[PDB]
């Protein structure tokens, strides 16, 4: 259709544009536009085109509107070749009919409601009133009043009317539907009595409010009766319109929308590019080749194994450029051992999380609902669940390996020579727990420390690469320069870590280590010296975060002592299962906390990443929140 | 490039239609003149012929 000399649109990160542009040139494409800046020159546009487009928009919108009144909206699937005019035409009869039913249907509901409310008090008024509704010789005034209010209005009336009214009420509960009958002559005084009071007349909607009550009542009664049945019919028809028309609506929708995009596309490019990515034009010899591949860096719109699997997807995301310094990707293969490896549980902690994974590949029945995680049906976005199968793999793996460092843990919390712990007793493994014991514990703590060290190096090294390959001497020196300090830092720790080694051995070396630092920090000149203290907080942080990942972990395993070996009396094999009153609970409590746990790692990681150590999402900047990023 | 080849050829086809029209606007003029002239000689052939026949008539009458 439109773009008769025919469009391809590619979209993306701003930096990639030249490389993208090159990929597009290769494909078989011709007449590549705009190519920096914008504003095509005899390949633009006219409102005629726009008008026709407007017609597609009208249909598009219309299909949605009608779909709306019914309820739901369509999904990307099968458009189909149409007349645009045809599409517009198509929409009209069906929509109007459905819309018509809708229009009646709300009106019916309202009718039903109103009628229901009014009929009974009005009936009460009518019953008192008869003979005198008619008369305008005499006048009668309906109003409803409640039974406290029965003295207050009665006083207002009494003052005006005296006794020249005879004053009537009929009950219907919640008050009595009331009449004053007065002479017609007395009418203002009577109405005024209501006015002083603030008591209100049962005037009702429409013609009905105005009426002789008895007669009015008949009509009102009829509405009450009629409306639910009427509603049923209309509702059936509407329901009927969904059942049949939902596919129809969709096909139209898909078409109309796509067309709307398609049309739009032509219009924006016509004028003025994607932005920083790239359009262009093909004769139909050029047209088949071009779309299919042209290397992932971009989004277009058309006219061992565990370790490979999400990473494989990160290989492409390596390839998106911006600079000669290396790009986002690393996070997923970097996380995994520790991620899993905070989880260091036992029979009742870690080792049952498989069941949950088995409820993501098998499911559950025993409470309300779940059916298939692959079909990800939900209380809050379904969609996501289908997408995050990449995550479903990593999670199934997370538990599996996590269970396993729990089982590493139960090597050292079973076996009778290693600790006092049973090899496999009459209660349960991991029984009178002892990794808590300070010396044993000390080792597990110190275990945590190491991963933090890795991170110190990994980040600053990447800074030196930043300036290396983005060429900034400023970045280079900054990333490199801090390492000048480091030998001396290692000295100071060591004098306590070995209690000896340095700090008075390599502390003479400290005297020279401190100067080396400030040399190239000084080469940039840098009044921006002070910061170096703050860097000192960070190292310790790695330790602490890991430390907690251990400690809170460890604590968790030691909580299964007070979960399942003991928690009232001392827990043997019956009071043990008097703890099982609590035991089921502890699983769900355990569930809550562990969501908490993982996020520290990533926070940790983010400290490094968004100090621009390998990552060009960071406080914005193309690429997008890391939250969204790593998951594929 | 196949696009610009086509852009040339088209504009060039557009030229071909301008010329063809212009030619026709010349031809119609050419043919107008031709009729116009024919019609004029006719008017004077008629009259003179008559003015002859009658004149001589007056010669006879004398």
XYZ file of C-alpha atoms in Angstrom:
694
model
C 0.000 0.000 0.000
C 1.258 3.433 1.172
C 4.913 4.110 0.865
C 4.502 2.750 -2.652
C 8.229 3.069 -2.772
C 8.219 1.177 0.414
C 9.253 1.791 3.995
C 11.349 -0.062 6.541
C 11.577 1.383 10.098
C 14.245 0.697 12.600
C 14.453 2.154 16.004
C 16.967 2.010 18.813
C 19.543 3.465 21.190
C 20.811 6.738 19.805
C 24.525 5.765 19.611
C 24.047 2.727 17.316
C 22.728 4.790 14.373
C 25.729 4.732 11.979
C 26.281 1.008 12.493
C 22.549 0.423 12.095
C 22.624 2.617 9.008
C 25.426 0.527 7.584
C 23.469 -2.704 8.325
C 20.481 -1.274 6.437
C 22.607 -0.162 3.450
C 23.963 -3.758 3.069
C 20.534 -5.414 3.064
C 19.618 -4.420 -0.520
C 17.985 -1.169 0.504
C 18.189 2.002 -1.559
C 17.300 5.683 -0.971
C 18.276 5.539 2.644
C 16.996 8.436 4.542
C 17.358 10.848 6.259
C 20.749 9.797 7.672
C 21.386 12.781 10.065
C 19.653 15.388 10.356
C 16.042 15.242 9.170
C 13.622 16.729 6.631
C 13.330 14.789 3.423
C 13.261 16.570 0.218
C 10.552 15.366 -2.143
C 9.937 12.243 -0.146
C 7.651 14.024 2.319
C 3.947 14.222 2.546
C 0.533 15.831 2.112
C -2.691 16.009 4.160
C -4.518 13.891 1.664
C -2.488 10.993 2.784
C -3.128 12.069 6.292
C -6.829 12.275 5.643
C -7.019 8.753 4.467
C -4.981 7.881 7.507
C -7.534 9.720 9.563
C -10.109 7.491 8.137
C -8.074 4.441 9.335
C -7.861 6.076 12.738
C -11.584 6.558 12.845
C -12.148 2.885 12.178
C -9.385 1.894 14.540
C -10.735 3.970 17.305
C -14.253 2.934 16.451
C -13.539 -0.781 16.693
C -12.065 -0.191 20.030
C -15.014 1.939 21.133
C -17.593 -0.553 20.278
C -15.391 -3.306 21.685
C -15.240 -1.157 24.803
C -18.927 -0.819 25.392
C -19.148 -4.520 25.162
C -16.137 -4.879 27.399
C -12.696 -6.128 26.320
C -10.275 -5.259 23.565
C -8.408 -7.287 20.950
C -4.822 -8.612 20.614
C -2.094 -8.565 17.810
C -2.716 -11.505 15.594
C -4.377 -11.564 12.189
C -5.211 -8.369 10.413
C -6.410 -8.875 6.915
C -6.436 -6.933 3.642
C -9.412 -4.614 3.584
C -10.690 -1.597 1.926
C -10.075 1.128 4.431
C -13.490 2.272 3.375
C -14.595 -1.296 3.710
C -13.183 -1.417 7.176
C -14.969 1.784 8.067
C -18.142 0.455 6.539
C -17.754 -2.873 8.297
C -17.543 -1.287 11.639
C -20.633 0.784 11.240
C -23.621 -1.602 11.253
C -22.411 -3.957 13.869
C -21.171 -1.296 16.200
C -24.359 0.687 15.994
C -26.439 -2.330 16.815
C -24.355 -3.292 19.808
C -24.082 0.280 20.950
C -27.845 0.568 20.693
C -28.335 -2.397 22.946
C -25.831 -0.873 25.346
C -27.621 2.392 25.397
C -30.796 0.768 26.368
C -29.161 -1.484 28.898
C -27.789 1.158 31.287
C -31.012 3.049 30.920
C -32.886 -0.125 31.944
C -30.725 -0.633 35.003
C -31.377 2.894 36.137
C -35.071 2.455 35.523
C -35.139 -0.690 37.518
C -33.449 0.939 40.420
C -35.532 4.087 40.499
C -38.792 2.278 40.155
C -37.926 -0.081 42.928
C -37.164 2.758 45.279
C -40.181 4.873 44.647
C -43.090 2.495 44.265
C -43.837 1.638 47.872
C -43.796 5.144 49.571
C -45.752 6.425 46.619
C -48.236 3.643 47.070
C -48.626 4.744 50.641
C -49.186 8.319 49.537
C -51.657 7.128 46.874
C -53.659 5.041 49.340
C -54.230 7.985 51.646
C -54.811 10.382 48.804
C -57.637 8.954 46.779
C -60.314 11.278 45.510
C -58.231 14.303 46.354
C -55.425 13.838 43.906
C -58.025 14.898 41.385
C -59.327 17.930 43.182
C -57.665 21.245 42.676
C -60.620 22.691 44.605
C -58.736 21.279 47.500
C -54.993 20.729 47.175
C -52.922 17.874 48.461
C -49.205 17.848 48.747
C -47.205 14.627 48.994
C -43.969 14.604 50.832
C -42.206 11.986 52.812
C -41.202 12.575 56.408
C -39.615 10.404 59.134
C -41.145 9.880 62.568
C -39.098 12.316 64.734
C -39.703 14.702 61.903
C -43.401 13.897 62.218
C -43.613 16.390 65.130
C -41.335 19.028 63.435
C -43.172 19.373 60.092
C -46.441 18.945 61.980
C -45.504 22.085 63.924
C -44.649 23.942 60.708
C -47.955 22.854 59.247
C -49.814 23.550 62.481
C -48.682 27.137 62.464
C -49.636 27.663 58.850
C -52.672 25.408 58.465
C -54.130 25.329 61.957
C -56.749 22.602 61.672
C -57.963 23.524 58.195
C -55.778 20.703 57.152
C -56.304 17.158 58.076
C -52.907 15.589 58.200
C -52.195 12.040 57.084
C -49.355 9.592 57.098
C -49.016 5.999 56.005
C -46.148 3.784 57.014
C -43.705 1.978 54.871
C -40.909 1.867 57.449
C -38.129 4.406 57.617
C -40.927 6.935 57.884
C -44.396 7.488 56.722
C -45.378 8.765 53.356
C -47.220 11.867 54.082
C -49.911 14.030 52.777
C -51.152 17.380 53.826
C -54.527 18.172 52.410
C -55.381 21.716 52.572
C -57.678 23.893 50.612
C -56.476 25.047 47.259
C -56.002 28.525 48.566
C -54.064 27.138 51.551
C -51.389 25.672 49.261
C -48.560 28.256 49.699
C -48.869 28.153 53.454
C -48.670 24.363 53.373
C -45.674 24.244 51.006
C -44.004 26.927 53.088
C -44.466 24.746 56.199
C -42.463 22.095 54.411
C -39.975 24.787 53.385
C -39.357 26.023 56.929
C -38.851 22.394 57.902
C -36.642 21.413 54.997
C -38.821 18.293 54.519
C -38.905 17.332 50.854
C -41.570 16.201 48.404
C -41.376 12.907 46.589
C -41.178 14.577 43.224
C -39.824 11.971 40.930
C -38.108 12.036 37.522
C -39.831 13.103 34.369
C -43.505 13.147 33.583
C -43.909 10.810 36.483
C -43.001 13.350 39.185
C -45.645 15.728 38.037
C -48.569 13.244 37.889
C -51.734 12.352 39.815
C -50.355 9.873 42.296
C -52.697 6.958 41.768
C -52.142 7.044 38.054
C -48.477 7.746 38.525
C -48.293 4.736 40.752
C -49.574 2.508 38.003
C -46.808 3.628 35.679
C -44.173 3.366 38.373
C -45.279 -0.131 39.241
C -44.940 -1.161 35.629
C -41.384 0.104 35.464
C -40.427 -1.857 38.559
C -41.737 -5.039 37.092
C -40.470 -4.517 33.596
C -36.879 -3.511 33.860
C -34.949 -6.688 34.930
C -36.602 -8.746 32.218
C -35.841 -6.145 29.652
C -32.337 -6.082 30.841
C -32.036 -9.771 30.303
C -32.841 -9.441 26.685
C -30.461 -6.645 25.961
C -27.725 -8.348 27.871
C -28.210 -11.492 25.876
C -27.769 -9.622 22.677
C -24.642 -7.910 23.888
C -23.250 -11.150 25.104
C -24.138 -12.532 21.714
C -22.207 -9.749 20.040
C -19.081 -10.675 21.933
C -19.345 -14.376 21.178
C -19.647 -13.967 17.480
C -17.956 -10.732 16.875
C -14.921 -10.949 19.013
C -12.799 -12.481 16.264
C -14.251 -10.112 13.731
C -13.521 -7.125 15.881
C -10.035 -8.297 16.453
C -9.251 -8.861 12.817
C -10.540 -5.479 12.060
C -8.724 -4.096 15.038
C -5.422 -5.607 14.154
C -5.823 -4.358 10.713
C -6.928 -0.942 11.644
C -4.291 -0.416 14.186
C -1.515 -1.764 12.148
C -2.652 0.383 9.339
C -2.758 3.310 11.597
C 0.836 2.633 12.590
C 1.797 1.842 9.055
C 0.336 4.997 7.780
C 1.782 6.974 10.590
C 5.120 5.500 9.982
C 5.124 6.697 6.484
C 4.145 10.108 7.603
C 6.809 10.536 10.250
C 9.617 9.165 8.169
C 8.303 11.122 5.185
C 9.183 14.280 6.913
C 11.765 13.347 9.485
C 13.407 9.887 10.307
C 12.970 7.551 13.312
C 15.088 9.916 15.353
C 18.443 8.315 15.728
C 17.930 5.046 14.022
C 16.820 4.828 10.399
C 14.165 4.562 7.641
C 14.525 3.878 3.909
C 12.952 2.856 0.623
C 13.027 -0.342 -1.418
C 11.873 -1.238 -4.923
C 10.369 -4.710 -4.603
C 13.562 -6.259 -5.806
C 15.136 -4.769 -2.685
C 12.055 -5.427 -0.581
C 12.382 -9.175 0.307
C 15.986 -9.325 1.515
C 16.120 -6.475 3.758
C 13.994 -7.053 6.817
C 15.036 -10.489 7.889
C 18.356 -9.896 9.514
C 20.616 -6.931 9.769
C 22.023 -7.795 13.220
C 20.370 -7.295 16.614
C 21.029 -3.849 18.040
C 17.627 -2.469 17.225
C 13.834 -2.903 16.955
C 12.076 -2.871 13.646
C 8.495 -2.569 12.510
C 7.669 -4.467 9.362
C 5.810 -3.363 6.273
C 27.799 -25.948 30.420
C 24.135 -25.433 29.286
C 22.750 -23.603 32.515
C 25.363 -20.936 32.026
C 24.850 -20.511 28.364
C 21.046 -20.049 28.481
C 20.264 -16.385 29.602
C 23.871 -15.406 28.773
C 23.406 -16.485 25.200
C 20.833 -13.757 25.054
C 23.318 -11.313 26.611
C 25.754 -11.978 23.797
C 23.543 -9.785 21.592
C 23.381 -7.047 24.168
C 27.130 -6.962 24.313
C 26.976 -6.052 20.670
C 24.981 -2.850 21.020
C 27.728 -0.169 20.962
C 28.166 3.236 22.360
C 31.840 3.570 22.967
C 34.961 1.389 22.834
C 34.559 0.630 26.523
C 32.507 -2.512 27.044
C 28.700 -2.502 27.333
C 25.949 -4.002 29.563
C 25.579 -7.759 29.635
C 27.849 -9.115 32.433
C 25.431 -9.270 35.290
C 23.777 -12.601 34.822
C 26.836 -14.888 34.633
C 28.466 -12.816 37.308
C 25.746 -13.361 39.962
C 24.959 -17.023 39.989
C 27.110 -19.062 42.478
C 26.676 -16.659 45.384
C 23.099 -15.854 44.406
C 22.288 -19.444 44.928
C 25.079 -19.599 47.508
C 23.492 -17.443 50.170
C 21.085 -20.319 50.420
C 22.898 -22.746 52.653
C 19.937 -24.435 54.365
C 18.706 -27.781 55.504
C 15.868 -30.340 55.371
C 13.231 -27.753 56.346
C 14.861 -24.528 55.091
C 16.296 -24.791 51.588
C 15.574 -28.351 50.628
C 11.763 -28.089 50.165
C 11.851 -25.108 47.781
C 11.795 -27.622 44.911
C 8.099 -28.204 45.677
C 7.479 -24.590 44.815
C 9.462 -24.978 41.584
C 7.367 -28.090 41.030
C 4.405 -25.721 41.510
C 5.788 -23.668 38.651
C 5.982 -26.738 36.379
C 3.412 -28.778 38.213
C 0.951 -26.542 40.090
C -1.424 -26.552 43.096
C -5.108 -27.341 43.764
C -5.540 -27.286 47.429
C -6.645 -23.767 48.284
C -8.052 -21.822 45.335
C -6.772 -21.948 41.749
C -3.315 -22.196 39.790
C -3.297 -24.205 36.597
C -0.184 -23.641 34.393
C 2.739 -21.179 34.955
C 3.500 -21.445 31.321
C 0.060 -19.997 30.741
C 0.741 -17.504 33.571
C -2.933 -16.539 34.482
C -3.088 -13.833 37.064
C -4.297 -11.289 39.622
C -1.840 -8.716 38.329
C -0.154 -8.951 34.874
C -0.417 -12.458 33.305
C 1.737 -11.429 30.406
C 4.861 -11.058 32.306
C 4.671 -14.614 33.537
C 4.966 -15.960 30.020
C 7.936 -13.704 29.321
C 9.837 -14.577 32.455
C 10.322 -18.146 31.628
C 13.994 -17.076 31.189
C 13.699 -16.318 34.846
C 11.690 -19.533 35.496
C 14.786 -21.395 34.351
C 17.068 -19.362 36.524
C 14.787 -19.738 39.523
C 14.441 -23.474 39.104
C 18.213 -23.495 38.923
C 18.353 -20.977 41.901
C 16.621 -23.320 44.208
C 18.438 -26.366 42.869
C 21.880 -25.011 43.457
C 20.750 -23.127 46.548
C 19.556 -26.364 48.055
C 22.920 -27.764 47.207
C 24.998 -25.288 49.178
C 22.538 -26.228 51.898
C 23.646 -29.723 51.404
C 27.268 -28.601 51.515
C 26.149 -27.092 54.791
C 24.651 -30.405 55.928
C 27.979 -32.220 55.287
C 29.273 -30.033 58.122
C 26.020 -30.276 60.115
C 25.785 -34.030 59.783
C 28.568 -36.588 60.249
C 29.666 -37.408 63.809
C 33.433 -36.868 63.475
C 33.187 -33.391 61.967
C 31.023 -31.996 64.800
C 29.019 -33.603 67.576
C 26.148 -33.725 64.982
C 24.439 -37.063 64.084
C 25.245 -38.843 60.829
C 21.546 -39.344 60.288
C 19.567 -39.689 63.570
C 16.059 -40.674 64.647
C 14.936 -37.018 64.527
C 16.195 -35.173 61.502
C 19.644 -33.999 60.182
C 21.324 -30.749 61.292
C 20.175 -31.521 64.761
C 21.922 -29.669 67.667
C 23.429 -26.992 65.497
C 27.084 -25.901 65.765
C 28.112 -23.819 62.745
C 26.931 -20.974 64.983
C 29.830 -21.730 67.275
C 32.177 -18.801 67.029
C 35.202 -20.573 65.565
C 33.123 -22.581 63.046
C 31.143 -19.480 62.379
C 34.304 -17.431 61.922
C 35.182 -19.452 58.907
C 31.793 -18.946 57.273
C 32.026 -15.257 57.925
C 35.481 -15.052 56.434
C 34.108 -17.047 53.480
C 31.779 -14.115 52.770
C 34.641 -11.572 52.808
C 36.341 -13.007 49.715
C 33.578 -12.298 47.200
C 33.685 -8.714 48.247
C 37.400 -8.511 47.329
C 36.621 -9.707 43.820
C 34.208 -6.906 43.416
C 36.714 -4.222 44.476
C 38.977 -5.212 41.667
C 36.292 -5.768 39.125
C 34.894 -2.286 39.316
C 37.999 -0.116 39.333
C 39.615 -2.216 36.576
C 36.622 -1.517 34.421
C 37.075 2.234 35.139
C 40.615 2.030 33.855
C 39.132 0.321 30.803
C 36.590 3.144 30.635
C 39.184 5.731 30.127
C 41.253 3.400 28.127
C 38.705 2.648 25.470
C 36.524 5.724 25.698
C 39.843 7.401 25.648
C 39.349 9.691 28.587
C 42.475 10.212 30.453
C 40.241 11.666 33.108
C 38.451 8.385 33.477
C 41.583 6.384 32.953
C 43.551 8.062 35.724
C 40.656 8.064 38.055
C 40.122 4.284 37.708
C 43.818 3.442 37.683
C 44.832 6.005 40.261
C 42.854 4.590 43.125
C 44.780 1.305 42.792
C 47.940 3.265 43.625
C 46.518 3.469 47.127
C 45.642 -0.198 47.377
C 48.974 -1.851 48.394
C 48.971 0.316 51.489
C 45.333 -0.503 52.223
C 46.288 -4.186 52.147
C 49.089 -3.370 54.497
C 46.778 -1.825 57.118
C 44.263 -4.676 57.146
C 47.029 -7.311 57.239
C 48.549 -6.031 60.483
C 45.345 -7.118 62.197
C 44.338 -9.977 59.868
C 47.521 -11.864 60.498
C 47.900 -9.631 63.567
C 51.115 -9.023 61.720
C 52.251 -8.965 58.095
C 52.216 -5.364 57.315
C 51.188 -1.963 58.624
C 54.514 -1.819 60.338
C 56.217 -4.104 57.808
C 54.559 -3.018 54.639
C 53.691 0.125 56.629
C 57.046 1.598 55.679
C 55.912 0.794 52.194
C 52.690 2.650 53.081
C 54.725 5.833 53.289
C 55.497 5.456 49.569
C 52.168 3.881 48.701
C 50.212 6.975 49.711
C 52.064 9.286 47.297
C 51.713 6.995 44.187
C 47.950 7.376 44.421
C 47.854 11.083 44.173
C 50.200 11.399 41.300
C 47.717 10.985 38.462
C 44.839 12.282 40.364
C 47.093 15.316 40.336
C 47.718 14.937 36.620
C 44.047 15.728 36.060
C 44.827 18.474 38.625
C 41.841 17.597 40.641
C 40.726 19.895 43.433
C 38.365 16.888 43.605
C 40.631 15.088 45.974
C 38.483 14.615 49.195
C 36.397 11.796 47.846
C 38.959 9.214 48.481
C 37.780 8.771 52.081
C 34.357 7.739 50.886
C 35.884 5.054 48.706
C 37.146 3.626 51.936
C 33.577 3.031 53.049
C 32.885 0.931 50.000
C 35.307 -1.900 50.481
C 33.950 -2.665 53.875
C 30.496 -2.553 52.420
C 31.289 -5.516 50.165
C 32.208 -7.479 53.148
C 29.196 -6.467 55.130
C 26.713 -7.198 52.447
C 28.189 -10.602 51.836
C 28.490 -11.035 55.576
C 24.801 -10.623 56.101
C 24.117 -12.827 53.124
C 25.953 -15.393 55.139
C 24.852 -14.356 58.619
C 21.175 -13.922 57.899
C 21.529 -17.157 55.958
C 23.163 -18.870 58.907
C 20.675 -17.443 61.287
C 17.946 -18.867 59.057
C 19.408 -22.344 59.330
C 19.722 -21.968 63.073
C 16.104 -20.975 63.189
C 15.176 -24.467 61.995
C 16.483 -25.625 65.369
C 13.718 -23.551 66.902
C 11.496 -24.624 64.051
C 11.804 -28.340 63.900
C 14.102 -29.678 66.561
C 12.589 -27.660 69.373
C 10.247 -24.750 69.972
C 8.029 -25.768 72.863
C 8.952 -28.270 75.283
C 12.246 -29.196 73.637
C 10.837 -30.996 70.512
C 11.487 -34.780 70.290
C 9.150 -36.614 67.901
C 5.697 -35.547 69.101
C 6.147 -32.199 70.772
C 8.433 -31.958 67.733
C 5.219 -32.218 65.804
C 3.612 -29.888 68.313
C 6.162 -27.596 66.773
C 4.657 -28.736 63.452
C 1.623 -26.638 64.473
C 4.174 -23.871 63.959
C 6.120 -25.874 61.304
C 3.790 -25.258 58.366
C 3.788 -21.574 59.289
C 7.570 -21.374 59.287
C 7.646 -22.317 55.595
C 5.482 -19.312 54.711
C 7.452 -16.978 57.002
C 10.609 -18.335 55.316
C 9.078 -17.525 51.962
C 8.579 -13.871 52.917
C 12.109 -13.149 53.941
C 13.920 -14.699 51.109
C 12.480 -12.269 48.686
C 14.241 -9.767 50.786
C 17.472 -11.538 50.567
C 18.364 -11.479 47.015
C 18.080 -7.886 46.538
C 21.176 -7.066 48.480
C 23.345 -8.728 45.904
C 21.937 -6.767 43.166
C 22.231 -3.641 45.198
C 25.773 -4.569 45.748
C 26.224 -5.143 42.092
C 24.588 -1.881 41.248
C 27.124 -0.043 43.421
C 29.756 -1.120 40.977
C 27.707 -1.063 37.834
C 26.347 2.373 38.190
C 29.718 3.710 39.146
C 29.777 3.117 35.399
C 31.740 -0.013 35.679
C 30.551 -1.618 32.496
C 27.100 -0.147 32.224
C 25.560 2.702 30.210
C 22.200 2.572 31.753
C 22.987 4.540 34.884
C 20.818 7.429 35.986
C 19.106 7.188 32.608
C 21.431 7.089 29.573
C 20.470 4.675 26.751
C 19.757 1.255 27.876
C 17.043 1.209 30.452
C 16.661 0.420 34.197
C 18.668 -2.584 35.206
C 15.544 -3.956 36.806
C 14.248 -4.409 33.344
C 17.577 -5.205 31.697
C 19.201 -8.366 32.782
C 16.341 -10.812 32.783
C 16.588 -12.158 29.272
C 20.123 3.233 -8.124
C 16.749 1.873 -9.173
C 14.826 4.587 -7.300
C 16.633 7.533 -8.891
C 16.557 5.869 -12.307
C 12.829 5.775 -11.945
C 12.680 9.363 -10.670
C 14.581 10.473 -13.749
C 12.438 8.460 -16.151
C 9.226 9.734 -14.622
C 10.099 13.397 -14.654
C 11.287 12.692 -18.118
C 7.849 11.085 -18.890
C 6.311 14.198 -17.436
C 8.355 16.219 -19.924
C 6.961 14.022 -22.671
C 3.428 14.973 -21.792
C 4.185 18.725 -21.607
C 5.637 18.660 -25.067
C 2.769 16.643 -26.433
C 0.215 19.135 -25.096
C 2.171 22.136 -26.372
C 2.366 20.552 -29.783
C -1.401 20.063 -29.788
C -1.939 23.714 -28.769
C 0.162 24.661 -31.761
C -1.670 22.301 -34.100
C -5.101 23.605 -33.126
C -3.891 27.125 -33.880
C -2.411 25.956 -37.175
C -5.693 24.419 -38.145
C -7.746 27.402 -37.012
C -5.887 29.714 -39.305
C -6.356 27.397 -42.202
C -10.153 27.402 -41.780
C -10.296 31.098 -41.108
C -8.517 31.871 -44.360
C -10.647 29.466 -46.387
C -13.751 31.129 -45.088
C -12.611 34.593 -45.998
C -11.828 33.873 -49.581
C -15.241 32.268 -49.745
C -16.928 35.439 -48.618
C -15.231 37.502 -51.241
C -15.650 34.978 -54.026
C -19.375 34.978 -53.516
C -19.835 38.660 -53.435
C -17.630 39.457 -56.386
C -19.247 36.870 -58.495
C -22.587 38.385 -57.824
C -21.360 41.933 -58.454
C -20.295 40.909 -61.859
C -23.308 39.135 -63.019
C -25.542 41.997 -61.979
C -23.188 44.664 -63.291
C -23.199 43.251 -66.753
C -26.911 43.050 -66.415
C -26.884 46.801 -66.179
C -24.741 46.798 -69.292
C -27.515 44.885 -71.097
C -30.112 47.213 -69.746
C -28.349 50.127 -71.403
